[PDB]
Structure formats: C-alpha cells, structure tokens
Amino acid sequence: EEGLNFPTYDGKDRVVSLSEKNFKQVLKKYDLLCLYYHEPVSSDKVTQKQFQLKEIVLELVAQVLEHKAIGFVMVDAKKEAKLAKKLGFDEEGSLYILKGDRTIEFDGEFAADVLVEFLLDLIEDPVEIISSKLEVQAFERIEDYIKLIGFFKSEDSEYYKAFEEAAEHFQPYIKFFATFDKGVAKKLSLKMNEVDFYEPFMDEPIAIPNKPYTEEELVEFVKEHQRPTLRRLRPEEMFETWEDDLNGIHIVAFAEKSDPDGYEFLEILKQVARDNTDNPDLSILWIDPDDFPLLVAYWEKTFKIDLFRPQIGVVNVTDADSVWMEIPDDDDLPTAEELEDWIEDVL
Amino acid sequence: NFPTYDGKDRVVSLSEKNFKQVLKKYDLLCLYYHEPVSSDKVTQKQFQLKEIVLELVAQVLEHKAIGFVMVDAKKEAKLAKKLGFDEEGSLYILKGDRTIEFDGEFAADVLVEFLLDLIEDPVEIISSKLEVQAFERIEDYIKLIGFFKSEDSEYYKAFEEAAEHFQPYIKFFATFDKGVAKKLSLKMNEVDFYEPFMDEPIAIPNKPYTEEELVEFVKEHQRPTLRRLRPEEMFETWEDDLNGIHIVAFAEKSDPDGYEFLEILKQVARDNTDNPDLSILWIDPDDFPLLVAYWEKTFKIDLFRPQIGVVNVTDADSVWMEIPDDDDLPTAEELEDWIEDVLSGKINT
Ligand SMILES: [Ca+2]
Ligand SMILES: [Ca+2]
Ligand SMILES: [Ca+2]
Ligand SMILES: [Ca+2]
Ligand SMILES: [Ca+2]
Ligand SMILES: [Ca+2]
Ligand SMILES: [Ca+2]
Ligand SMILES: [Ca+2]
Ligand SMILES: [Ca+2]
Ligand SMILES: [Ca+2]
Ligand SMILES: [Ca+2]
Ligand SMILES: [Ca+2]
Ligand SMILES: [Ca+2]
Ligand SMILES: [Ca+2]
Ligand SMILES: [Ca+2]
Ligand SMILES: [Ca+2]
Ligand SMILES: [Ca+2]
Ligand SMILES: [Ca+2]
Ligand SMILES: [Ca+2]
Ligand SMILES: [Ca+2]
Ligand SMILES: [Ca+2]
Ligand SMILES: [Ca+2]
Ligand SMILES: [Ca+2]
Ligand SMILES: [Ca+2]
Ligand SMILES: [Ca+2]
Ligand SMILES: [Ca+2]
Ligand SMILES: [Ca+2]
Ligand SMILES: [Ca+2]
Ligand SMILES: [Ca+2]
Ligand SMILES: [Ca+2]
Ligand SMILES: [Ca+2]
Ligand SMILES: [Ca+2]
Ligand SMILES: [Ca+2]
Ligand SMILES: [Ca+2]
Ligand SMILES: [Ca+2]
Ligand SMILES: [Ca+2]
Ligand SMILES: [Ca+2]
Numbered sequence: 001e002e003g004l005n006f007p008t009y010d011g012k013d014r015v016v017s018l019s020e021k022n023f024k025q026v027l028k029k030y031d032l033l034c035l036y037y038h039e040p041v042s043s044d045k046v047t048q049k050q051f052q053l054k055e056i057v058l059e060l061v062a063q064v065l066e067h068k069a070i071g072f073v074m075v076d077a078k079k080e081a082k083l084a085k086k087l088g089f090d091e092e093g094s095l096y097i098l099k100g101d102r103t104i105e106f107d108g109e110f111a112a113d114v115l116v117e118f119l120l121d122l123i124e125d126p127v128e129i130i131s132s133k134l135e136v137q138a139f140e141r142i143e144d145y146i147k148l149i150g151f152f153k154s155e156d157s158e159y160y161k162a163f164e165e166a167a168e169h170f171q172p173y174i175k176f177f178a179t180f181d182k183g184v185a186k187k188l189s190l191k192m193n194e195v196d197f198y199e200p201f202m203d204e205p206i207a208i209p210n211k212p213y214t215e216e217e218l219v220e221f222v223k224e225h226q227r228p229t230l231r232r233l234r235p236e237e238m239f240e241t242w243e244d245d246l247n248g249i250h251i252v253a254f255a256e257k258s259d260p261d262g263y264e265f266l267e268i269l270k271q272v273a274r275d276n277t278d279n280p281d282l283s284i285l286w287i288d289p290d291d292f293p294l295l296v297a298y299w300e301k302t303f304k305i306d307l308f309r310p311q312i313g314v315v316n317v318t319d320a321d322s323v324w325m326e327i328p329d330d331d332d333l334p335t336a337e338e339l340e341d342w343i344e345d346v347l
Numbered sequence: 348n349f350p351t352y353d354g355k356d357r358v359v360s361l362s363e364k365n366f367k368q369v370l371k372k373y374d375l376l377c378l379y380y381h382e383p384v385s386s387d388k389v390t391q392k393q394f395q396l397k398e399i400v401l402e403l404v405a406q407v408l409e410h411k412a413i414g415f416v417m418v419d420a421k422k423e424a425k426l427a428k429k430l431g432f433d434e435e436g437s438l439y440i441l442k443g444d445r446t447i448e449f450d451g452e453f454a455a456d457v458l459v460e461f462l463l464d465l466i467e468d469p470v471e472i473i474s475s476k477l478e479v480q481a482f483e484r485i486e487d488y489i490k491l492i493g494f495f496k497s498e499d500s501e502y503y504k505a506f507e508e509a510a511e512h513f514q515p516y517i518k519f520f521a522t523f524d525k526g527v528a529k530k531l532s533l534k535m536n537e538v539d540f541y542e543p544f545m546d547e548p549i550a551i552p553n554k555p556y557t558e559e560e561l562v563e564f565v566k567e568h569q570r571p572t573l574r575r576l577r578p579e580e581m582f583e584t585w586e587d588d589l590n591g592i593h594i595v596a597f598a599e600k601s602d603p604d605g606y607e608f609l610e611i612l613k614q615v616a617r618d619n620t621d622n623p624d625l626s627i628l629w630i631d632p633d634d635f636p637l638l639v640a641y642w643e644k645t646f647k648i649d650l651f652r653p654q655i656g657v658v659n660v661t662d663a664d665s666v667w668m669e670i671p672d673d674d675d676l677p678t679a680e681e682l683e684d685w686i687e688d689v690l691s692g693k694i695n696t
Contacts, residue, residue: 001396002453003582005641005663064640109349117636124651128603131674134610138603177603260471260520263481293460297407298348308467331474 007064014062015055018073020083030071032123033098034058034106037089040078060112061119070119093239097122102168107240118172118236126167129155130179136187139177144232144286147198148222149177151190159193159212166218173237174222197221200228201270202277230273233287241285245317251284251346252322253312254305258290261330265310271336272343281347312339314346350407357405358398361416363426373414375466376441377401377449380432383421403455404462413462440465445511450583461515461579469510473522479530482520487575487629490541491565492520494533502536502555509561516580517565540564543571544613545620573616576630584628588660592696594627594689595665596655597648601633604673608653614679615686624690627655655682657689659696666696 001008018026018035027033036058041051055074062072075084077092088103089096095106097119104122108114130139130149139149148167152160160178167176179185190196193212196205208221233241242250253269256262269284276282289296289307296307303322305311310333313324325342327334334342361369361378370376379401384391398417405415418427420435431446432439438449438458442465449461473482473492482492491510495503503521510519522528533539536555539548551564576584585593596612599605612627619625632639632650639650646665648654653676656667668685670677677685688694 001393002637003451006452006637007641060637064637067640067644113636116639117633120632120636120639120651129674130603132607134607135603137610138606141606260473260478260481263484264475264477267477267480289463290460293456293463294349294407296459296463297410298350301410308463331472 007060009056009060010063012063013059014066015058015072015074018075018080018083020080023083026071026073027098029069031069032119033071033073034119035087035089035096035098036072036074037077037084037092037094037096038074039092040076054110057110057112057115061115064112064116065119068120068123070123099168099171104171105240106236107243108234108236108238111235114235121172125164126171127164127176127178130177130184131181136184139188142175142198144200145175146173146200146222146226146228147175147177148195148218149179149188149190149198150195151179151185151188151192153192154180157193162213162215163195163218165215166213166222169219170222170226174226197225199225199277200232201230201273203274227283228273229277229279229282230269230284230286233285233291235291238292242317246281246283248317249346250315250317251282251312251343252287252315253284253310254287254289254299254307255310256289256307259310261333262288262310265312265330265333268333268336268339269312272339275336275340282343312342350403352399352403352406355406356402357409358401358415358417361418361423361426363423363429366426369414369416370441372412374412375462376414376416377462378416378418378430378432378439378441380418380420380427380435380437380439382435383419397453400453400455400458404458407455407459408462411466413466442511442514445514447514448583449579450586451577451579451581454578457578464515469514470507470519470521473520473527474524479527482531485518485541487543488518489516489543489565489569489571490518490520491538491561492522492531492533492541493538494522494528494531494535496535497523500536505556505558506538506561508558509556509565512562513565517569540568542568542620543575544573544616546617570626572620572622572625573612573627573629576628576634578634581635585660589624589626591660592689593658593660594625594655594686595630595658596627596653597630597632597642597650598653599632599650602653604676605631605653608655608673608676611676611679611682612655615682618679619683619686622690625686627686655685657694657696664696666694 038051041048058072075089077084087096091105097104097106099122106115106118130136150163152163163176163178188196195208195211195213195218197208198205208218227244231241255266255269257266266286269286273284300307302320303313303324305324309327309330311324311327313322315322325334381394384394401415405413418432420427430439434448440447440449447465451457473479493506495506497503506519506521531539538551538554538556538561540551541548551561553560570587574584598609600609609629612629616627643650645663646656646667648667652670652673654667654670656665658665668677
C-alpha cells in the first residue's frame with residue numbers, strides 16, 4: 001500500500017450505473033452529484049479493463065468523500081441518451097458535477113487524489129472575501145491562475161450577488177475574490193462595484209468596462225478572455241486544456257519551477273507572454289514535469305528531448321509530432337527575442 | 348498516455364552472491380528492505396501491492412538504468428548488515444558510494460519524481476540574476492549556498508560531497524561570481540545555512556569547511572522550528588517525533604485563510620526558532636487529499652479552515668486549539684501561549 005493510514009477500498013458498492021427513473025431520487029441524496037458520462041463499454045477485453053480501473057478510482061473517491069455527501073454514478077451515453085441530453089452531457093469521458101442548478105465539468109487526470117482535491121474545492125463557495133493585509137498578500141501572490149477581484153459595499157449588495165453568481169460558472173478553475181473594505185479597495189485601485197481581471201503572468205489587470213455589471217456581463221467578459229497567453233497544464237485540467245488547441249497545435253514549454261534553470265526559463269517565457277499578450281492566436285502551454293512524473297519517460301521518448309533541462313517546442317495534437325528549439329545548455333538559455341523569433345516562424 | 352504495467356518481471360529478490368553483479372548493472376540501485384514474507388495472506392498480499400508499485404516505477408525508469416531489487420531482512424540479514432539497512436519498510440538507494448533512504452508515500456508518481464531528482468547532481472550553480480532570484484524564493488526547504496573560486500577548488504568539492512549526504516532533501520547551491528556573493532553577502536569559502544521560513548541565514552563558523560564540518564553542522568540543525576510535511580518524506584518526518592507528539596498545523600496555502608494562518612505561524616517560528624523542544628509540522632491538505640477524510644474523522648476538525656493542534660503518535664489522539672473562525676485567527680502571542688502550554692504539558696492528549 002502507500003503507507004500508514006492511506007485509505008483502502010472497502011469493497012462496498014457506492015458507484016452504480018444510473019438510469020433516468022432513479023435520477024431525481026439519487027439527486028436528492030447528496031450535496032453534490034458526480035456523473036461519469038461514458039461511452040458504452042466494449043465487450044472487448046482491453047477496454048473493459050480500462051473502464052474498470054476508472055470505476056475503481058470513482059469507488060475510492062466515493063468512499064473518502066462519503067461523509068461530505070458527494071454521490072458518484074455512471075451514465076451510459078447510448079442507453080441513457082435522453083437523460084444525458086436533458087442534462088446537456090455531450091462529451092464522453094468527462095465527469096459532470098451537479099452543484100445546485102449549476103453544472104461543472106471535470107476533464108483531467110482520472111486519479112483518486114486528483115479528483116478528491118478538485119472536489120474539495122468545488123464543495124466550498126467560489127468567492128473568497130479579502131479583508132486583512134495577509135489576505136491581500138495572498139491574493140497578490142496568485143500568478144498562474146486567472147483571478148478576478150471586485151469592490152462592493154457588503155455581502156447584501158446585489159452587485160456582489162451578481163459577481164458571486166458569475167463566479168459559480170467557472171468554479172473552481174477561475175478564482176473570484178471580493179472585498180468590502182475601503183482600505184483594500186484603495187490599495188488594489190478598485191472603485192465601487194468595479195471588477196479587475198488578472199490574466200496569468202501579467203503585471204497589470206484589466207478593469208472590466210461599464211460598471212456596474214450583471215451576471216451575464218461578467219460571464220461574457222471572462223469567456224472572451226478565458227484563454228491566457230501563457231497557461232499552465234494542471235493534472236485536473238490536462239485534457240480540457242489539451243483539447244483546447246489552436247489550429248491543431250500547441251506551443252509546449254517544459255519548465256521545472258523548483259529547478260533554478262526551470263525557474264529561469266519560465267521567467268523568460270513570462271516576458272514573451274507579456275510582449276504578445278494581445279495575440280489571440282498565441283497560447284503557450286507551460287508544463288512542469290513535477291506535476292506529471294509518470295509522463296516524463298513518455299515525453300522524452302516521444303519528443304526526443306531531455307526533461308532535466310527546460311524545453312520549448314510545437315506539438316501537433318493529431319499524431320503527437322513535434323519540432324523543438326535547440327537548447328543544449330540551460331546556462332545559455334535563449335533571450336525573449338530569440339524565443340520570439342523562433343516562435344514567430346511557428347505562427 | 349499514462350503508462351500501465353506490462354506484466355514483465357523487473358523487480359526480483361536480491362541475494363548476496365548476486366549483489367555485486369546486480370550493482371554493476373545499473374546507474375542507480377534501489378533496494379526495498381522488507382520484513383520476511385510469511386506464510387500468511389497476512390499478508391503476502393500487502394507486500395505484492397508494494398511490489399506492483401515498484402514494478403511500474405522500474406518500467407518507466409527502465410531507459411534510465413534504474414534498478415529495483417528486494418532484500419529479505421531475514422534471509423539476507425548479513426548483506427543487510429553490510430549495507431547498513433536497519434529500517435523495515437524503507438527503500439534504500441545506492442548512488443555511487445552513498446546510500447539514500449526513501450521513507451515516504453509509496454506511490455509510483457511520488458517515487459519517480461523523487462528518483463528523477465536523485466539522479467541529477469546535488470549542487471546547483473547560481474550565476475544569473477534569475478538564478479539568484481530562484482534561490483531566494485526557496486522558502487520551505489533547508490538550503491545552503493557557498494561562494495568558491497571555481498569547480499576545481501577543494502573547498503567546493505568538500506561542499507559538493509557534503510551535499511551528497513542529504514540529497515535530495517536538503518538543497519545545496521554554489522556560486523563562483525563575486526557579484527552573486529556580494530548580493531548574498533558571502534565571503535570566499537563561506538557557506539550560509541538557511542533554516543526554512545527564517546529571514547536570516549546562519550554563516551557556518553570556521554571556514555573553510557571539510558566534508559565532515561558541513562555534514563555535522565547540518566545534522567545539528569536538521570530539524571527546523573517550522574517544517575513542512577512532504578509526501579516523499581512523510582514517514583521519515585512523522586517518525587521524528589518529540590516526546591511522542593507532533594504539533595500539527597493544517598494550512599491550505601492556496602486558500603487565503605490558510606495562507607493567512609501560515610504567515611502567523613512563521614512569525615511564531617521566527618520568535619521561537621532557538622527552542623530545541625519546538626518543531627511545528629505544517630501540513631497542506633492539498634498534498635494529502637486522500638488523508639483528509641481520515642484526518643477530519645480522527646481529529647474531529649474542519650480542514651476547510653486552518654487548524655493547529657498536538658497529535659499523539661501512539662494512538663493518533665489529539666487536542667486542538669479553538670479557532671472556530673478563520674476571520675478571527677489567533678495572534679502570534681496567542682499561538683505562543685497555546686504552544687507553550689502544550690510544551691509544558693498544560694495541554695495534553
Ligand atoms: Ca460499482
Ligand atoms: Ca460541452
Ligand atoms: Ca498522485
Ligand atoms: Ca488546487
Ligand atoms: Ca480549499
Ligand atoms: Ca475566507
Ligand atoms: Ca446561484
Ligand atoms: Ca482601477
Ligand atoms: Ca501586479
Ligand atoms: Ca454594465
Ligand atoms: Ca475530454
Ligand atoms: Ca471538455
Ligand atoms: Ca480540438
Ligand atoms: Ca538544473
Ligand atoms: Ca493575453
Ligand atoms: Ca509534484
Ligand atoms: Ca523535481
Ligand atoms: Ca542556468
Ligand atoms: Ca546563446
Ligand atoms: Ca516481481
Ligand atoms: Ca536506520
Ligand atoms: Ca519508516
Ligand atoms: Ca529535477
Ligand atoms: Ca543549473
Ligand atoms: Ca562523490
Ligand atoms: Ca554574511
Ligand atoms: Ca574549518
Ligand atoms: Ca527512516
Ligand atoms: Ca477559505
Ligand atoms: Ca515572543
Ligand atoms: Ca530553529
Ligand atoms: Ca495538489
Ligand atoms: Ca485545494
Ligand atoms: Ca481570514
Ligand atoms: Ca482572540
Ligand atoms: Ca509570548
Ligand atoms: Ca489519550
């Protein structure tokens with residue numbers, strides 16, 4: 001096993017296949033209902049096995065999250081097409097979570113620990129209130145996440161409630177914050193009912209025009225600015241991000257942040273991102289090898305690169321074919337301009 | 348594209364006749380020192396699960412010549428005595444003349460990430476502006492940096508060899524630039540010791556240093572006042588208890604309230620950094636999501652908020668400081684008073 005006190009599956013059957021007749025009944029039982037929308041299982045032997053692993057994973061997650069009332073069911077895409085269409089499920093292999101009237105999609109690494117950490121954040125309220133100095137400091141240190149902060153009069157303000165409702169659309173991928181403190185608003189240059197949008201790795205936020213905002217206005221603004229120029233590949237978002245390719249390719253950059261050379265290369269990448277942040281056709285994918293250790297060998301074999309050093313290249317999402325910038329020495333890293341010139345030819 | 352075990356048998360039991368012949372085969376040799384397998388499902392099974400993990404790691408690290416063997420504590424007690432294996436359940440790694448112990452979460456991804464860092468050279472060279480910046484932003488790791496003339500200096504080589512003792516748990520850095528040394532206030536052959544979450548380093552006395560001087564100084568300062576529980580170090584850290592108890596503080600750093608509480612904890616740690624009876628264990632729930640349910644049930648606490656308490660390592664029993672509101676966090680002084688009462692047995696389990 002993994003160690004002392006790591007949980008083991010108790011054989012109990014908490015995750016079963018869901019039919020439409022029992023939906024409204026199953027839905028009442030839990031705080032959150034997670035539905036694994038899958039394609040009908042082959043008889044084939046090797047897919048049946050690959051599916052069983054996923055259920056085993058869901059079973060373990062259901063066990064450890066039982067006390068927090070999160071239910072897990074499976075939905076056959078073919079046999080239960082009617083239920084799926086009514087709930088709006090159309091992507092197979094995705095885990096849909098029903099939280100109130102809202103629907104959140106999980107499309108990342110199908111592991112027990114990844115799912116649990118993800119769901120634990122999803123349970124809570126999407127908006128964090130920033131009041132103290134250390135809380136302001138906490139907000140300021142968020143770098144690789146899309147974050148929004150608004151200044152409102154109080155929690156009873158209708159303008160805050162609209163901001164809160166908009167936050168529910170993107171939970172927990174995009175972080176929403178709110179303050180009712182004039183001191184904090186002054187420091188963050190926020191006017192009453194004004195909301196600032198922070199793109200990852202950018203120095204200055206964008207004030208959303210024409211305040212105050214309705215729920216729809218905020219959702220629309222975020223959706224139009226939802227793809228950062230430099231975005232990080234996270235295990236809980238990996239397939240969602242990878243399927244969000246631009247013209248069939250990804251500009252992939254490997255950088256181990258804990259490694260001084262990786263940190264070095266990432267900082268140069270940030271500058272490249274800032275210089276071309278207004279390019280809608282450009283989105284650089286930052287992958288920290290430490291977040292995907294079991295894919296390191298695969299990446300080094302497929303991309304023919306050494307992941308002990310920072311790398312950047314262009315990956316074709318159809319056949320996993322790529323060309324990589326020649327960086328044999330991480331003490332002779334390319335400048336922002338040299339990266340840009342190499343990138344410029346890619347576009 | 349995540350790998351699955353292909354069924355091949357790469358992890359076998361190692362005997363002493365074949366130790367020499369196996370050691371020559373790999374760049375790194377990992378030996379799982381285990382208790383004797385019994386004639387019970389009591390459990391040959393538990394063991395096999397651990398072997399399955401080792402098999403998957405052996406598969407994905409095959410191209411890098413990383414070997415994995417198993418050492419029976421009974422049948423190979425003499426080899427074990429020769430190699431200095433004495434802890435049951437620990438994974439020992441032979442890197443050249445050195446022996447490194449792994450004593451953390453026995454998972455494939457955890458092991459691979461750990462071993463990948465262990466393969467590389469222990470000392471990172473800090474030269475550029477961004478590299479200096481990279482070193483400075485290291486907060487929760489014990490780190491050392493020294494200023495030397497060059498890589499050919501015997502004083503650097505002593506520093507490098509000393510780094511091999513603690514790889515990859517303690518980070519060693521070196522610079523040969525007077526510009527970096529002036530920024531970091533380093534004199535020639537001087538080495539600064541940075542305790543986690545402290546504002547100021549400690550200049551190791553009596554420079555220059557031999558390998559022995561550095562190793563022994565680190566050993567004397569190897570348990571930080573505020574230390575983080577890491578998956579790859581969790582059991583090593585947990586077994587390093589003081590009087591049967593750990594002062595455990597849960598703080599989700601990504602959460603502003605958890606970040607808030609952690610900063611207060613740093614203040615308490617800095618103010619009481621010279622207390623040898625004090626070592627606070629910081630646990631970020633995001634690093635152990637599969638232990639959240641266990642913790643909430645056993646400790647009777649809400650891990651959606653920052654918590655701090657004293658946990659008894661024998662029966663996992665604990666009492667927790669009352670922080671019902673994370674917008675009314677205790678001050679640094681209130682934390683000290685509560686901690687002092689724990690250390691003085693005024694608050695026990
Ligand atoms: Ca089942
Ligand atoms: Ca859709
Ligand atoms: Ca994992
Ligand atoms: Ca997270
Ligand atoms: Ca949380
Ligand atoms: Ca809060
Ligand atoms: Ca709502
Ligand atoms: Ca403004
Ligand atoms: Ca800024
Ligand atoms: Ca408006
Ligand atoms: Ca998908
Ligand atoms: Ca998707
Ligand atoms: Ca696509
Ligand atoms: Ca490096
Ligand atoms: Ca942009
Ligand atoms: Ca990691
Ligand atoms: Ca690493
Ligand atoms: Ca470098
Ligand atoms: Ca060059
Ligand atoms: Ca075997
Ligand atoms: Ca020992
Ligand atoms: Ca141990
Ligand atoms: Ca590394
Ligand atoms: Ca380096
Ligand atoms: Ca050596
Ligand atoms: Ca000094
Ligand atoms: Ca000396
Ligand atoms: Ca140990
Ligand atoms: Ca919170
Ligand atoms: Ca004091
Ligand atoms: Ca100390
Ligand atoms: Ca995590
Ligand atoms: Ca979290
Ligand atoms: Ca707070
Ligand atoms: Ca108080
Ligand atoms: Ca005091
Ligand atoms: Ca007791």
